[PDB]
């Protein structure tokens, strides 16, 4: 391809790129609002959390760290902020 | 029914052993080698000598009461070749054609799980 719009890449191909290989690098991680099953208290949890986060109300682990994204425990619902 | 021995056939590339024992292998019934059938060293392992060796074994087996045999064919094994010698195929066919009955057949070549150093040197035997 000799002629191509480098300043306006296709958003489809833009989403497949590595996070450092876009025009402006941008993280693919996010923050979530986590509902434990026991109660209803907003707890902000990083998507790629490295800590076994526990909510303040009840000492229940919300997520377990993995190689990539943290794994939410059963009965815990998240909503992306 | 039948009376089983064990035909332990050791077929190397220099000779052929046709050795019939009992089930335990502690009692030897007949042991005829291909070298007892020829007067040349070069064909002690010939298919022809193995067939003659097997026929003498079968005749000896019949007069003792052995009517069937199990086959345990082996090559030299160890650090040496694992393929059976040319006489092992003839001794097996001769036994079957001699009125002896055949049971299980197995290869029992000794095979190392590594091993000791094999003779010949690093560059092998140069011919």
């Amino acid at each position: 391809v000799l002629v191509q719009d480098l300043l306006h890449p296709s958003p489809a191909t833009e989403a497949k790129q590595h996070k450092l290989k876009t025009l402006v690098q941008q993280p693919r991680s996010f923050f979530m609002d986590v509902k434990c099953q026991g109660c209803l208290n907003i707890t902000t949890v990083f998507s790629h959390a490295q800590t076994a986060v526990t909510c303040d109300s009840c000492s229940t682990v919300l997520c377990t760290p993995t190689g990539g994204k943290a794994k939410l425990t059963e009965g815990c619902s998240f909503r992306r902020k | 029914s039948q009376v089983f021995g064990v035909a332990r056939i050791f077929a190397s590339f220099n000779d052929t052993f046709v050795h019939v024992t009992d089930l335990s292998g502690k009692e030897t019934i007949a042991r005829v080698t291909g070298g007892m059938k020829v007067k040349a060293d070069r064909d002690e392992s010939s298919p022809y000598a193995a067939m003659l060796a097997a026929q003498d074994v079968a005749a000896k087996c019949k007069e003792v009461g052995i009517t069937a045999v199990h086959i345990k064919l082996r090559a030299t094994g160890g650090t040496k070749t694992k393929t059976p010698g040319p006489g092992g195929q003839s001794a097996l066919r001769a036994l079957a054609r001699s009125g002896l009955r055949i049971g299980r057949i197995e290869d029992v070549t000794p095979v190392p799980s590594x091993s000791t150093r094999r003779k010949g040197g690093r560059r092998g035997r140069r011919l």
Partner: protein, 100 residues
């Protein structure tokens, strides 16, 4: 000059490979370089599979196979015609020969 881009062996991303002895002459040859053939032969030749089946005391007894993996050095294999000299352009072809 360089005859093969692979140097006649199969060592890439590796320092050293332990040797194997040629079946025929017991020469030390690196495991990746040795010409290896897997053979599954009938223990009884097809001529004798009939008369030996009649002498069997077992109805429907399957004759065991003979499994063996052979290692050859380059000299052992070339002499026994296991591999042959190929033309300069035909050397690159590394698919198994279309015989079976």
């Amino acid at each position: 000059p360089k005859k093969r881009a692979s140097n006649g062996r199969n060592k890439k991303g590796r320092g050293h490979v332990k040797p194997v002895r040629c079946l025929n002459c017991a020469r030390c040859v690196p495991k990746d370089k040795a010409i290896k053939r897997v053979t599954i032969r009938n223990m009884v030749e097809a001529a004798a599979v009939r008369d030996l089946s009649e002498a069997s005391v077992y109805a429907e007894y399957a004759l065991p196979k003979l499994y063996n993996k052979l290692h050859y050095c380059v000299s052992c294999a070339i002499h026994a015609r296991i591999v042959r000299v190929r033309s300069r352009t035909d050397r690159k072809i590394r698919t198994p020969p279309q015989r079976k």
